[PDB]
Amino acid sequence: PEMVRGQVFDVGPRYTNLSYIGEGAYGMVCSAYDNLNKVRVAIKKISPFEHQTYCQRTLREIKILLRFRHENIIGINDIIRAPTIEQMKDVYIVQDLMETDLYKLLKTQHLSNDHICYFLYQILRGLKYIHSANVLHRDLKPSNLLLNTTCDLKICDFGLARVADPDHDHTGFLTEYVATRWYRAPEIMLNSKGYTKSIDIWSVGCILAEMLSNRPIFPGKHYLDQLNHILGILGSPSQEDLNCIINLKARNYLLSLPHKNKVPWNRLFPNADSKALDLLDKMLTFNPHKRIEVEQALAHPYLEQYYDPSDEPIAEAPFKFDDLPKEKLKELIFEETARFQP
Numbered sequence: 001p002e003m004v005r006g007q008v009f010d011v012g013p014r015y016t017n018l019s020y021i022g023e024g025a026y027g028m029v030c031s032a033y034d035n036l037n038k039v040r041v042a043i044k045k046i047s048p049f050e051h052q053t054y055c056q057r058t059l060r061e062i063k064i065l066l067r068f069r070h071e072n073i074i075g076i077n078d079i080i081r082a083p084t085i086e087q088m089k090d091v092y093i094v095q096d097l098m099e100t101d102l103y104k105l106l107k108t109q110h111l112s113n114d115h116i117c118y119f120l121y122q123i124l125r126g127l128k129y130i131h132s133a134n135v136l137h138r139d140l141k142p143s144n145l146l147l148n149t150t151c152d153l154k155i156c157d158f159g160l161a162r163v164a165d166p167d168h169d170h171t172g173f174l175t176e177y178v179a180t181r182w183y184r185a186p187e188i189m190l191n192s193k194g195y196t197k198s199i200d201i202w203s204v205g206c207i208l209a210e211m212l213s214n215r216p217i218f219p220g221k222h223y224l225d226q227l228n229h230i231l232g233i234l235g236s237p238s239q240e241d242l243n244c245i246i247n248l249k250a251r252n253y254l255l256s257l258p259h260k261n262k263v264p265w266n267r268l269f270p271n272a273d274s275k276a277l278d279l280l281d282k283m284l285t286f287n288p289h290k291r292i293e294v295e296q297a298l299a300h301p302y303l304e305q306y307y308d309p310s311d312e313p314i315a316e317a318p319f320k321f322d323d324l325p326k327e328k329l330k331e332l333i334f335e336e337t338a339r340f341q342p
């Protein structure tokens, strides 16, 4: 049984010659040689079975990814686990081996405008498919975007995904939220549970800004500070957009703030393509009802060299799926992974 950096990675004998890559949520990611297909692959170790929310995230991702099939979504090629529930302690997910992720790339590489445009196209193309299944990714960020050696992009990690539920999106002010802080839409902190598609478009807008400058556009340090960063750039919301926020605590918090001027996008990004900044503005719109939707974004002039709706496929059907004890959830993970046995 091979080990990498002092930890057991029990995937043989099909997968050998392991090398560290990085970290998933419940375990590390390695590369390995696939002795059957004769190519190196990526493998993620998942040890979820102690914690019920861990089991939730693992099951959710497996259920979605076994149904999804799209060029810009990384799939599941194989799942490795013990033959019996009694013996199963870890699960290993085998996926295509990519070359890097966008978080790592942006730490040292400046992107040409042609790279930015192609990455953004591919993000939106994958997102079109996800949203067409009535699913929200809910944690889009550079570390969840993988790139191969020719800059083809795939979206990773559906562990926070949910079915869209816009009729039950409303909540109170300062409602706690799980997804990554820097990519949270402003309404998360005001009145939203993040159950509508507009939550993902905001995150893509954050990713676009970060590709233009190699730095996060809104790097808040804590829950409410994230909103201060956003308002520091967008400026104060209009009366119309405030009137859309019926919750009094949220509205009165915004009314308590001094007026803030909008920072022009071309001041923040003086080298950027003007069409890219127009699309950026529409993705980083404060009012989620006015925010651009994924199919509109694909049709934006910035993406004209790539846009082709006949080559931007959608899901066959809407996706349908916690008080579930982890013992039922481990049982459910066991059953969901049976198709890859032996």
Ligand SMILES: *[C@@H]1CCOC(=O)c2c(O)cc(O)cc2OCC[C@H](O)[C@H](O)C(=O)C1
Pocket (backbone or CB within 6 Å): 021, 022, 023, 024, 025, 029, 042, 043, 044, 074, 095, 096, 097, 098, 099, 100, 101, 143, 144, 146, 156, 157
């Ligand atoms: C994605 C989990 C799968 O990640 C990978 O397959 C992966 C490959 O193939 C190559 C490289 O360079 C990195 C990879 O993932 C790193 C981890 C990733 O950023 C994220 O944390 C995930 O776990 C989601």
